[PDB]
Design a protein around this nucleic acid. Structure first.
Ligand SMILES: CS[C@H]1O[C@H]([C@H](NC(=O)[C@H]2NC[C@@H]3C[C@H](CC(C)C)CCO[C@H]32)[C@H](C)Cl)[C@H](O)[C@H](O)[C@H]1O
Ligand SMILES: [Mg+2]
Ligand SMILES: [Mg+2]
Ligand SMILES: [Mg+2]
Ligand SMILES: [Mg+2]
Ligand SMILES: [Mg+2]
Ligand SMILES: [Mg+2]
Ligand SMILES: [Mg+2]
Ligand SMILES: [Mg+2]
Ligand SMILES: [Mg+2]
Ligand SMILES: [Mg+2]
Ligand SMILES: [Mg+2]
Ligand SMILES: [Mg+2]
Ligand SMILES: [Mg+2]
Ligand SMILES: [Mg+2]
Ligand SMILES: [Mg+2]
Ligand SMILES: [Mg+2]
Ligand SMILES: [Mg+2]
Ligand SMILES: [Mg+2]
Ligand SMILES: [Mg+2]
Ligand SMILES: [Mg+2]
Ligand SMILES: [Mg+2]
Ligand SMILES: [Mg+2]
Ligand SMILES: [Mg+2]
Ligand SMILES: [Mg+2]
Ligand SMILES: [Mg+2]
Ligand SMILES: [Mg+2]
Ligand SMILES: [Mg+2]
Ligand SMILES: [Mg+2]
Ligand SMILES: [Mg+2]
Ligand SMILES: [Mg+2]
Ligand SMILES: [Mg+2]
Ligand SMILES: [Mg+2]
Ligand SMILES: [Mg+2]
Ligand SMILES: [Mg+2]
Ligand SMILES: [Mg+2]
Ligand SMILES: [Mg+2]
Ligand SMILES: [Mg+2]
Ligand SMILES: [Mg+2]
Ligand SMILES: [Mg+2]
Ligand SMILES: [Mg+2]
Ligand SMILES: [Mg+2]
Ligand SMILES: [Mg+2]
Ligand SMILES: [Mg+2]
Ligand SMILES: [Mg+2]
Ligand SMILES: [Mg+2]
Ligand SMILES: [Mg+2]
Ligand SMILES: [Mg+2]
Ligand SMILES: [Mg+2]
Ligand SMILES: [Mg+2]
Ligand SMILES: [Mg+2]
Ligand SMILES: [Mg+2]
Ligand SMILES: [Mg+2]
Ligand SMILES: [Mg+2]
Ligand SMILES: [Mg+2]
Ligand SMILES: [Mg+2]
Ligand SMILES: [Mg+2]
Ligand SMILES: [Mg+2]
Ligand SMILES: [Mg+2]
Ligand SMILES: [Mg+2]
Ligand SMILES: [Mg+2]
Ligand SMILES: [Mg+2]
Ligand SMILES: [Mg+2]
Ligand SMILES: [Mg+2]
Ligand SMILES: [Mg+2]
Ligand SMILES: [Mg+2]
Ligand SMILES: [Mg+2]
Ligand SMILES: [Mg+2]
Ligand SMILES: [Mg+2]
Ligand SMILES: [Mg+2]
Ligand SMILES: [Mg+2]
Ligand SMILES: [Mg+2]
Ligand SMILES: [Mg+2]
Ligand SMILES: [Mg+2]
Ligand SMILES: [Mg+2]
Ligand SMILES: [Mg+2]
Ligand SMILES: [Mg+2]
Ligand SMILES: [Mg+2]
Ligand SMILES: [Mg+2]
Ligand SMILES: [Mg+2]
Ligand SMILES: [Mg+2]
Ligand SMILES: [Mg+2]
Ligand SMILES: [Mg+2]
Ligand SMILES: [Mg+2]
Ligand SMILES: [Mg+2]
Ligand SMILES: [Mg+2]
Ligand SMILES: [Mg+2]
Ligand SMILES: [Mg+2]
Ligand SMILES: [Mg+2]
Ligand SMILES: [Mg+2]
Ligand SMILES: [Mg+2]
Ligand SMILES: [Mg+2]
Ligand SMILES: [Mg+2]
Ligand SMILES: [Mg+2]
Ligand SMILES: [Mg+2]
Ligand SMILES: [Mg+2]
Ligand SMILES: [Mg+2]
Ligand SMILES: [Mg+2]
Ligand SMILES: [Mg+2]
Ligand SMILES: [Mg+2]
Ligand SMILES: [Mg+2]
Ligand SMILES: [Mg+2]
Ligand SMILES: [Mg+2]
Ligand SMILES: [Mg+2]
Ligand SMILES: [Mg+2]
Ligand SMILES: [Mg+2]
Ligand SMILES: [Mg+2]
Ligand SMILES: [Mg+2]
Ligand SMILES: [Mg+2]
Ligand SMILES: [Mg+2]
Ligand SMILES: [Mg+2]
Ligand SMILES: [Mg+2]
Ligand SMILES: [Mg+2]
Ligand SMILES: [Mg+2]
Ligand SMILES: [Mg+2]
Ligand SMILES: [Mg+2]
Ligand SMILES: [Mg+2]
Ligand SMILES: [Mg+2]
Ligand SMILES: [Mg+2]
Ligand SMILES: [Mg+2]
Ligand SMILES: [Mg+2]
Ligand SMILES: [Mg+2]
Ligand SMILES: [Mg+2]
Ligand SMILES: [Mg+2]
Ligand SMILES: [Mg+2]
Ligand SMILES: [Mg+2]
Ligand SMILES: [Mg+2]
Ligand SMILES: [Mg+2]
Ligand SMILES: [Mg+2]
Ligand SMILES: [Mg+2]
Ligand SMILES: [Mg+2]
Ligand SMILES: [Mg+2]
Ligand SMILES: [Mg+2]
Ligand SMILES: [Mg+2]
Ligand SMILES: [Mg+2]
Ligand SMILES: [Mg+2]
Ligand SMILES: [Mg+2]
Ligand SMILES: [Mg+2]
Ligand SMILES: [Mg+2]
Ligand SMILES: [Mg+2]
Ligand SMILES: [Mg+2]
Ligand SMILES: [Mg+2]
Ligand SMILES: [Mg+2]
Ligand SMILES: [Mg+2]
Ligand SMILES: [Mg+2]
Ligand SMILES: [Mg+2]
Ligand SMILES: [Mg+2]
Ligand SMILES: [Mg+2]
Ligand SMILES: [Mg+2]
Ligand SMILES: [Mg+2]
Ligand SMILES: [Mg+2]
Ligand SMILES: [Mg+2]
Ligand SMILES: [Mg+2]
Ligand SMILES: [Mg+2]
Ligand SMILES: [Mg+2]
Ligand SMILES: [Mg+2]
Ligand SMILES: [Mg+2]
Ligand SMILES: [Mg+2]
Ligand SMILES: [Mg+2]
Ligand SMILES: [Mg+2]
Ligand SMILES: [Mg+2]
Ligand SMILES: [Mg+2]
Ligand SMILES: [Mg+2]
Ligand SMILES: [Mg+2]
Ligand SMILES: [Mg+2]
Ligand SMILES: [Mg+2]
Ligand SMILES: [Mg+2]
Ligand SMILES: [Mg+2]
Ligand SMILES: [Mg+2]
Ligand SMILES: [Mg+2]
Ligand SMILES: [Mg+2]
Ligand SMILES: [Mg+2]
Ligand SMILES: [Mg+2]
Ligand SMILES: [Mg+2]
Ligand SMILES: [Mg+2]
Ligand SMILES: [Mg+2]
Ligand SMILES: [Mg+2]
Ligand SMILES: [Mg+2]
Ligand SMILES: [Mg+2]
Ligand SMILES: [Mg+2]
Ligand SMILES: [Mg+2]
Ligand SMILES: [Mg+2]
Ligand SMILES: [Mg+2]
Ligand SMILES: [Mg+2]
Ligand SMILES: [Mg+2]
Ligand SMILES: [Mg+2]
Ligand SMILES: [Mg+2]
Ligand SMILES: [Mg+2]
Ligand SMILES: [Mg+2]
Ligand SMILES: [Mg+2]
Ligand SMILES: [Mg+2]
Ligand SMILES: [Mg+2]
Ligand SMILES: [Mg+2]
Ligand SMILES: [Mg+2]
Ligand SMILES: [Mg+2]
Ligand SMILES: [Mg+2]
Ligand SMILES: [Mg+2]
Ligand SMILES: [Mg+2]
Ligand SMILES: [Mg+2]
Ligand SMILES: [Mg+2]
Ligand SMILES: [Mg+2]
Ligand SMILES: [Mg+2]
Ligand SMILES: [Mg+2]
Ligand SMILES: [Mg+2]
Ligand SMILES: [Mg+2]
Ligand SMILES: [Mg+2]
Ligand SMILES: [Mg+2]
Ligand SMILES: [Mg+2]
Ligand SMILES: [Mg+2]
Ligand SMILES: [Mg+2]
Ligand SMILES: [Mg+2]
Ligand SMILES: [Mg+2]
Ligand SMILES: [Mg+2]
Ligand SMILES: [Mg+2]
Ligand SMILES: [Mg+2]
Ligand SMILES: [Mg+2]
Ligand SMILES: [Mg+2]
Ligand SMILES: [Mg+2]
Ligand SMILES: [Mg+2]
Ligand SMILES: [Mg+2]
Ligand SMILES: [Mg+2]
Ligand SMILES: [Mg+2]
Ligand SMILES: [Mg+2]
Ligand SMILES: [Mg+2]
Ligand SMILES: [Mg+2]
Ligand SMILES: [Mg+2]
Ligand SMILES: [Mg+2]
Ligand SMILES: [Mg+2]
Ligand SMILES: [Mg+2]
Ligand SMILES: [Mg+2]
Ligand SMILES: [Mg+2]
Ligand SMILES: [Mg+2]
Ligand SMILES: [Mg+2]
Ligand SMILES: [Mg+2]
Ligand SMILES: [Mg+2]
Ligand SMILES: [Mg+2]
Ligand SMILES: [Mg+2]
Ligand SMILES: [Mg+2]
Ligand SMILES: [Mg+2]
Ligand SMILES: [Mg+2]
Ligand SMILES: [Mg+2]
Ligand SMILES: [Mg+2]
Ligand SMILES: [Mg+2]
Ligand SMILES: [Mg+2]
Ligand SMILES: [Mg+2]
Ligand SMILES: [Mg+2]
Ligand SMILES: [Mg+2]
Ligand SMILES: [Mg+2]
Ligand SMILES: [Mg+2]
Ligand SMILES: [Mg+2]
Ligand SMILES: [Mg+2]
Ligand SMILES: [Mg+2]
Ligand SMILES: [Mg+2]
Ligand SMILES: [Mg+2]
Ligand SMILES: [Mg+2]
Ligand SMILES: [Mg+2]
Lengths: 275, 48
RNA sequence: CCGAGGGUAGGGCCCGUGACUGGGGCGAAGUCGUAACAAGGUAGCUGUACCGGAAGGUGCGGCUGGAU
RNA sequence: UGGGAGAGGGUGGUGGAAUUCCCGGAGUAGCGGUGAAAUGCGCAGAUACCGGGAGGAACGCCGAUGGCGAAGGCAGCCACCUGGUCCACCCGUGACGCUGAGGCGCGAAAGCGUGGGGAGCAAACCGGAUUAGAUACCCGGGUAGUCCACGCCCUAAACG
RNA sequence: CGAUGUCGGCUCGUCGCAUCCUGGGGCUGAAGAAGGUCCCAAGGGUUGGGCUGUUCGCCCAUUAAAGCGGCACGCGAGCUG
RNA sequence: GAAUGCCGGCAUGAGUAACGAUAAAGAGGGUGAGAAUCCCUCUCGCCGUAAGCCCAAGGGUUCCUACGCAAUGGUCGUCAGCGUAGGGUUAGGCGGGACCUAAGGUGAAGCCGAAAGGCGUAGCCGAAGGGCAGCCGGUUAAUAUUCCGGCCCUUCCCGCAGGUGCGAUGGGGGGACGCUCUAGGCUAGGGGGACCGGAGCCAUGGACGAGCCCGGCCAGAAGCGCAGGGUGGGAGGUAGGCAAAUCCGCCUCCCAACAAGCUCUGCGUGGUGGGGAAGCCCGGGUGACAACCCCCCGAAGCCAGGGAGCCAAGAAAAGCCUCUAAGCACAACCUGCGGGAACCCGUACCGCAAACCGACACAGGUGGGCGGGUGCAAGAGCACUCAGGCGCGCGGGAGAACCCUCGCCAAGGAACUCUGCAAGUUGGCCCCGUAACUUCGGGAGAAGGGGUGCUCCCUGGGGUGAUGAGCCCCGGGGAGCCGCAGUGAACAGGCUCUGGCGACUGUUUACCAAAAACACAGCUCUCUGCGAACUCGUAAGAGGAGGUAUAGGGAGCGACGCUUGCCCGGUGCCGGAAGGUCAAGGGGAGGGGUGCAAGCCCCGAACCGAAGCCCCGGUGAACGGCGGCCGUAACUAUAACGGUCCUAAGGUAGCGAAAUUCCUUGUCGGGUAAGUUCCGACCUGCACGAAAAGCGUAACGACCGGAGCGCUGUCUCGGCGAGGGACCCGGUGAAAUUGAACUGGCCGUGAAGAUGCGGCCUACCCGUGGCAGGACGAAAAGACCCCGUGGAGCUUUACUGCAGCC
RNA sequence: GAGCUAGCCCUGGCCAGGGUGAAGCUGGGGUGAGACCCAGUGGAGGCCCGAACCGGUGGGGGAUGCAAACCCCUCGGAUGA
């Protein structure tokens, strides 16, 4: 439940911060971090290839277990729930009875001291990981592989979930967080439950400095630039677009579809996204 | 006010130095040119 | 020392007045439509919401103080 | 103490009918709608029919002139949690009562905020008719909203 | 056009006279006082302020009067800007 | 002889400007051919969170000493960062390397690219980060944590002893981490002493004093004391840590728990080794057997990997410890002692500057540490001062205009002016008190006022210590004294009312614009199912992201409040297995050339044939657009109402002479004696209007308007005074400019504005201080304007290509 | 050519002093239980004043400059984008 501040500065008036209620442990597992190499948005040529990036807080990467079929049948206790600056979800620490320790992303409802397990035999219970074909239809799942053994690709951001709708041969029908209906191979893994920290969408950054902390440098409007710079650049005074609204590189940016035509995964999308 | 020449012995040697010139086609042409002209110094002096 | 009161500053209440503006009351024979009283020709009334020259209309819910 | 009836309330779950949509099959020259029509839809294969899928909302018969609640109001079925109430016995306390300015809480619909949801319905709105006009009544569309959670609003022909 | 800096102000003047005032006159529909109109006259004088960048103009309070023009629409190797 | 020609030489301006911070000088004595300028002394002034000291970078002998003065030095020069010569930089412990990794760079494997080359895992390189053993004093003209003295320490090799399953590039532990706030105890540093040591001093009216002045330490091994940091012990199981593992991880049992034990660090003490003032006497010597103690204040430094809170969630690797594998257990490693061994580079000097960056000995620029004392509430602020360092490398006079910087001003008080521009005013702290409005924070230092020094007396609490004295820190009550005046000097808000714009703190045109511009939280549309979209790249490969629709790209709008209407005919985008059109290809009715012929060769209709476009729909917080004429009410005027033409549809709410209104200073009201501006209204809005958002909005603003109070040299209207210049004398000595000049006024004339022509007038020859009317004065081959079939940026439904995509 | 300047990456460092006084916590009141109220504690913030530091608002000087952007007065930020 997001926390408000009293308006004792102009920015505190609107700032909201996460309650951090579910966090039980406040420093990371030293065996499961590595340095996160900040890019600033620059590629191996040194060129900015994603604008308006840099200057955010320092972070360590928490190694996340996106397979779990690594360790079928080996149960695990929920040691803690920790903060991860690298994603929107929270992460949960697992002390396997194996003695091995791993992080997974924390679904909604998971409690410290509960057990989790992964496998075709697993109980349909929040925190468990099964191949899609064994989860009952109608179940809300997250951290879904897209192809067998390639790692959880879908429904990982805070609050998201995919819902199983039906089965067709070797394939199950998922409704993704976007609302698209897709066929995912029944051997792909998924974790029962939805991702936690749903209140994440209700955070009000509150002032410009907050975006800077996150690595988000100021975004400048095409309309504000010059014709050398952008289709919307120039004009005496302010100016409407005066042409179909366009990106810095000239392509149209209000409706123009961009998914590749003959993409082979088209055979497996059933219905494009909603709303 | 701050002017444009802010000497830096490491900066000088790593940018204009003999080994930088040799690692690159443009750099070796530089050395070949200054040799052909008979320059006493093929590369800027930096005390290191 | 206190002290009528005089002065500087700042508030509170009341009265009168003000370009213009808001509706209200009233005024023998103005203009527009016809909402209500008969099932008043779409039963009416109603809180609310939205809309419309105007009465009003419509939605949601409610009342019978509704007719057959 | 022992009993009873009930859509009293809150939470979670879940069942079938129907409408809309989508996919398949079968099929053809209209369907729809009205006072009569037109807009609309349909040979780019609609309507009517059969199988499949998704989703929302509301609960047919029972049902009553019935039941419950202080009022607003409450209706598929299941479980849990909880209120009020009636009766029998005549067992306990011994007038401990009535009302109640202020206060506090509840309070149909509409409306408002933040998320979600959205089948049907439908203010506004658009179109077709009607008409002198028709910012209406009738028709084809249609956005809020109607639904859920939390928080506001506190009104009524809140009536017996 | 191998540059003759451009509006207004300020400062500093100087000149013209088709004279705003002061001096001298004729005519009057000049009783007096006060005016009108024309003639002579450039010696001197010709205020302070509100508004606007303003020049100009309008206004306030006065005044004998609150003149109008030229000097590269006088004057930026004098200032302002 | 001309090219604003080119190279050089030399003139003019001119003995002119200037001689580089207004911190400041004077005298005596030396030296020398020569002295304001060098050396010495006395006096004066200037810096002192520096203008003092210590590192780093950069510079590269500039350091020290002798001998010099042609040039360099803005004058002088005997001097010097200058010329000549000699001398000077000493390390196992300080810095870097023989150690480690970070970004990045490089790169066996591998990938890609016409060539050149581009990528790339490991690995390697890469430091001001991690890691690692030296402190104090003495010495030289010049180096010192380096030499020397004292006391400590590290690593390598070999040996002796005791101990142990020894053994690694492998496993594991550790290293290892943010921001704000902060405890305890110390140390650095500082203040005081009636106590301790000291050469002396008694002045000019007083003082021989519990008098003045000066000083009262630094380093130190083991132990020990104080304060801290780090750390559970044992057993059983074990499938995880890419082999193994007694280690680590996970599970269970027992015992210990704010402790203790063990270990590590700081501080104190500590054998011992050092230092040691003023003053006086020529850096030295004495003082001196110097003394070296007590109390107080006290860090931001130390104990440290301490504690708490918070969200934006805070390097790696080695050293180190532990575990084992090959191995080897005559070894090997561990602990203690002993001897031996211990390389390369830097080290001078400048270092907020005359030695570095600015062409200069250039008022500019340059990162880290130390930065004393007193008073002012604090402080690194301010004034004065210590240590230390300077008086800024031209001076001497004069006492004009004028200029700069500064002080004061009768009466008035914004009348100045585009504008209160500028300058006054106000000014710290304590107390009393404080409005509309508001998002309840604020607005607020609102406004406005009172207090402020010194002396005596009484007294409350706190720290240290002991509970007391002393010292030190916050206060309270009473009585008095002096002055024009008590934050007595210096540092230190003028205030209010009311509009426009932008919510806000931020950002910007380096060097004419700081704003209303950009950004900004927030809102909406749209793309993207992950080998994502998108971006860079020929590609490989990267970014996106080790992210996954509560996410990421693109666009506009821009806190918040109340809202955001109507038009899909045109352009865009989205949907549409029909129809039309449509390229290469298929197909081959049917012609043609040639050959004696089989054949060879050429053209070719119908028909099939993608995307695109046509066509059918949807779509506005997509590009965009949102009417005209005529008539009508019982006074008039005006039209709720009607007629008709047109459109895709005719502008809704809200707002309006506006950052928009032409006519315009519209009209009316307010404010003023007077108001083209301002504020409030009206609405015939030339030419507002709803995310190029509409209307508001508390708070905010070096933004732009209007008014008032305060107070002023802004002004009426100017006066006087100060210093730095201007002026004069001695020294040094530029510049742009320049056809040559023996270079006057008027009225004319002239290519139309004449020193230079005509006529006339005026005028002895040459300077110096001043002023700017002319020389169409200087500067810059007009930047406005045109011209050139000149150029370049930018745009699009101009033309034609190309990338990219289909 | 990024030793100037712009952005980002890695690793270090710096920000005197004073003021305001959020959440939370404690206690007290309150209630059926709550909300909530008071006091204390606490020490938040693109909070306030002001040096270092970073700037460059207005004016004046300078204009063959001390300087090819400087000097004086004044003024903005100063725990943060
Ligand atoms: C800045 S002064 C600087 O430039 C000056 C130059 N003037 C001129 O060129 C004038 N020529 C006529 C033109 C007319 C216009 C008429 C107007 C209506 C446009 C006015 C402008 O100029 C004048 C700039 C353009 Cl004023 C002089 O060269 C001066 O010698 C030098 O010092
Ligand atoms: Mg808040
Ligand atoms: Mg609040
Ligand atoms: Mg949480
Ligand atoms: Mg690690
Ligand atoms: Mg990366
Ligand atoms: Mg790279
Ligand atoms: Mg490269
Ligand atoms: Mg991008
Ligand atoms: Mg970027
Ligand atoms: Mg994320
Ligand atoms: Mg997280
Ligand atoms: Mg699949
Ligand atoms: Mg969000
Ligand atoms: Mg971040
Ligand atoms: Mg953003
Ligand atoms: Mg922007
Ligand atoms: Mg622009
Ligand atoms: Mg622009
Ligand atoms: Mg460009
Ligand atoms: Mg272009
Ligand atoms: Mg363009
Ligand atoms: Mg444009
Ligand atoms: Mg523009
Ligand atoms: Mg523009
Ligand atoms: Mg425009
Ligand atoms: Mg627009
Ligand atoms: Mg346009
Ligand atoms: Mg475009
Ligand atoms: Mg594209
Ligand atoms: Mg989709
Ligand atoms: Mg600079
Ligand atoms: Mg530099
Ligand atoms: Mg260097
Ligand atoms: Mg270096
Ligand atoms: Mg370098
Ligand atoms: Mg290089
Ligand atoms: Mg090199
Ligand atoms: Mg080559
Ligand atoms: Mg050379
Ligand atoms: Mg040679
Ligand atoms: Mg070279
Ligand atoms: Mg009196
Ligand atoms: Mg009539
Ligand atoms: Mg009716
Ligand atoms: Mg009727
Ligand atoms: Mg009726
Ligand atoms: Mg009717
Ligand atoms: Mg209607
Ligand atoms: Mg048809
Ligand atoms: Mg057909
Ligand atoms: Mg649905
Ligand atoms: Mg009884
Ligand atoms: Mg209600
Ligand atoms: Mg119609
Ligand atoms: Mg009709
Ligand atoms: Mg009733
Ligand atoms: Mg010209
Ligand atoms: Mg010329
Ligand atoms: Mg004047
Ligand atoms: Mg007369
Ligand atoms: Mg008369
Ligand atoms: Mg008379
Ligand atoms: Mg005269
Ligand atoms: Mg005027
Ligand atoms: Mg004029
Ligand atoms: Mg005028
Ligand atoms: Mg008169
Ligand atoms: Mg004139
Ligand atoms: Mg003339
Ligand atoms: Mg003229
Ligand atoms: Mg004219
Ligand atoms: Mg002029
Ligand atoms: Mg000028
Ligand atoms: Mg002028
Ligand atoms: Mg001139
Ligand atoms: Mg002149
Ligand atoms: Mg010739
Ligand atoms: Mg020349
Ligand atoms: Mg030439
Ligand atoms: Mg020549
Ligand atoms: Mg030449
Ligand atoms: Mg020459
Ligand atoms: Mg020669
Ligand atoms: Mg010469
Ligand atoms: Mg000469
Ligand atoms: Mg001269
Ligand atoms: Mg000069
Ligand atoms: Mg000079
Ligand atoms: Mg100075
Ligand atoms: Mg001074
Ligand atoms: Mg003297
Ligand atoms: Mg002297
Ligand atoms: Mg001398
Ligand atoms: Mg001499
Ligand atoms: Mg001197
Ligand atoms: Mg001397
Ligand atoms: Mg000091
Ligand atoms: Mg040099
Ligand atoms: Mg010499
Ligand atoms: Mg000489
Ligand atoms: Mg000589
Ligand atoms: Mg010289
Ligand atoms: Mg010089
Ligand atoms: Mg001599
Ligand atoms: Mg030396
Ligand atoms: Mg040594
Ligand atoms: Mg070696
Ligand atoms: Mg190569
Ligand atoms: Mg390297
Ligand atoms: Mg290092
Ligand atoms: Mg070392
Ligand atoms: Mg030591
Ligand atoms: Mg010697
Ligand atoms: Mg051992
Ligand atoms: Mg071992
Ligand atoms: Mg750690
Ligand atoms: Mg870490
Ligand atoms: Mg580190
Ligand atoms: Mg933080
Ligand atoms: Mg010490
Ligand atoms: Mg002290
Ligand atoms: Mg094992
Ligand atoms: Mg340490
Ligand atoms: Mg002795
Ligand atoms: Mg510090
Ligand atoms: Mg520490
Ligand atoms: Mg690494
Ligand atoms: Mg073996
Ligand atoms: Mg053996
Ligand atoms: Mg060697
Ligand atoms: Mg040395
Ligand atoms: Mg400096
Ligand atoms: Mg320094
Ligand atoms: Mg020096
Ligand atoms: Mg240069
Ligand atoms: Mg000098
Ligand atoms: Mg200098
Ligand atoms: Mg001291
Ligand atoms: Mg103070
Ligand atoms: Mg001096
Ligand atoms: Mg100085
Ligand atoms: Mg003189
Ligand atoms: Mg001065
Ligand atoms: Mg004074
Ligand atoms: Mg005066
Ligand atoms: Mg006044
Ligand atoms: Mg006054
Ligand atoms: Mg004024
Ligand atoms: Mg003003
Ligand atoms: Mg102005
Ligand atoms: Mg003052
Ligand atoms: Mg003051
Ligand atoms: Mg004061
Ligand atoms: Mg008020
Ligand atoms: Mg108030
Ligand atoms: Mg006010
Ligand atoms: Mg207000
Ligand atoms: Mg308030
Ligand atoms: Mg005050
Ligand atoms: Mg106050
Ligand atoms: Mg007092
Ligand atoms: Mg006194
Ligand atoms: Mg007195
Ligand atoms: Mg102040
Ligand atoms: Mg702003
Ligand atoms: Mg702005
Ligand atoms: Mg605005
Ligand atoms: Mg706003
Ligand atoms: Mg904003
Ligand atoms: Mg700020
Ligand atoms: Mg510029
Ligand atoms: Mg600029
Ligand atoms: Mg520039
Ligand atoms: Mg500004
Ligand atoms: Mg900007
Ligand atoms: Mg903003
Ligand atoms: Mg918004
Ligand atoms: Mg949205
Ligand atoms: Mg590209
Ligand atoms: Mg990555
Ligand atoms: Mg913006
Ligand atoms: Mg409001
Ligand atoms: Mg349209
Ligand atoms: Mg359309
Ligand atoms: Mg369209
Ligand atoms: Mg082809
Ligand atoms: Mg086609
Ligand atoms: Mg348009
Ligand atoms: Mg159009
Ligand atoms: Mg509306
Ligand atoms: Mg108007
Ligand atoms: Mg307006
Ligand atoms: Mg307009
Ligand atoms: Mg106007
Ligand atoms: Mg006008
Ligand atoms: Mg007017
Ligand atoms: Mg008036
Ligand atoms: Mg009008
Ligand atoms: Mg606009
Ligand atoms: Mg406002
Ligand atoms: Mg406001
Ligand atoms: Mg501002
Ligand atoms: Mg501003
Ligand atoms: Mg005023
Ligand atoms: Mg004056
Ligand atoms: Mg003077
Ligand atoms: Mg003389
Ligand atoms: Mg001379
Ligand atoms: Mg000379
Ligand atoms: Mg001649
Ligand atoms: Mg001559
Ligand atoms: Mg002459
Ligand atoms: Mg003459
Ligand atoms: Mg002429
Ligand atoms: Mg002439
Ligand atoms: Mg002449
Ligand atoms: Mg002649
Ligand atoms: Mg002649
Ligand atoms: Mg002549
Ligand atoms: Mg003549
Ligand atoms: Mg004459
Ligand atoms: Mg002279
Ligand atoms: Mg002169
Ligand atoms: Mg002149
Ligand atoms: Mg002059
Ligand atoms: Mg002239
Ligand atoms: Mg000329
Ligand atoms: Mg001239
Ligand atoms: Mg001239
Ligand atoms: Mg020039
Ligand atoms: Mg030329
Ligand atoms: Mg030209
Ligand atoms: Mg030119
Ligand atoms: Mg131009
Ligand atoms: Mg022209
Ligand atoms: Mg042409
Ligand atoms: Mg031509
Ligand atoms: Mg051309
Ligand atoms: Mg071109
Ligand atoms: Mg290069
Ligand atoms: Mg650099
Ligand atoms: Mg600071
Ligand atoms: Mg600090
Ligand atoms: Mg407090
Ligand atoms: Mg707390
Ligand atoms: Mg601040
Ligand atoms: Mg303050
Ligand atoms: Mg600056
Ligand atoms: Mg300035
Ligand atoms: Mg000023
Ligand atoms: Mg300049
Ligand atoms: Mg300056
Ligand atoms: Mg200043
Ligand atoms: Mg400040
Ligand atoms: Mg500060």
């Amino acid at each position: 439940a997001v926390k408000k501040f009293k308006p004792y500065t102009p920015s505190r008036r609107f700032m909201t911060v996460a309650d951090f209620s579910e966090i039980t442990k406040t420093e990371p597992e030293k065996s499961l971090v590595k340095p996160l190499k900040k890019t600033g948005g620059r590629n191996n040529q040194g060129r900015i290839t994603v604008r308006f990036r840099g200057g955010g807080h320092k972070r360590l990467y928490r190694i996340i277990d996106f397979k779990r079929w690594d360790k079928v049948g080996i149960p695990a206790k929920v040691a803690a729930i920790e903060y991860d600056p690298n994603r929107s979800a929270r992460i949960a620490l697992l002390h396997y009875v194996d003695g091995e320790k791993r992080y997974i992303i924390a679904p909604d409802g998971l409690q410290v001291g509960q057990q989790v397990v992964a496998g075709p035999d697993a109980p349909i219970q929040v925190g468990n990981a099964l191949p899609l074909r064994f989860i009952p239809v109608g179940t809300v799942v997250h951290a879904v592989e897209l192809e067998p053994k390639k790692g959880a690709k879908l429904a990982r951001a805070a609050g998201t979930s995919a819902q199983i709708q039906g089965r067709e041969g070797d394939y199950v029908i998922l409704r993704l967080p976007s609302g698209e209906l897709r066929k995912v191979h029944g051997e792909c893994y998924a974790t029962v439950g939805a991702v936690g920290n749903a209140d994440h969408k209700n955070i009000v950054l509150g002032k410009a400095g907050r975006s800077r902390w996150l690595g988000r440098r100021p975004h400048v409007r095409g309309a504000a630039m010059n014709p050398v710079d952008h289709p919307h650049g120039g004009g005496e005074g302010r100016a409407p677009r005066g042409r179909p609204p366009a990106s810095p590189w000239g392509w149209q940016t209000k409706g123009l579809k961009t998914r590749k035509r003959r993409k082979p995964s088209s055979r497996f999308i059933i219905a494009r996204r909603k709303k | 006010m701050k002017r444009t020449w802010q000497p830096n012995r490491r900066k000088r040697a790593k940018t204009h130095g003999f080994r930088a010139r040799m690692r690159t086609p443009g750099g070796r042409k530089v050395l070949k040119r200054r040799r052909q002209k008979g320059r006493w110094r093929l590369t800027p002096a930096v005390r290191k």
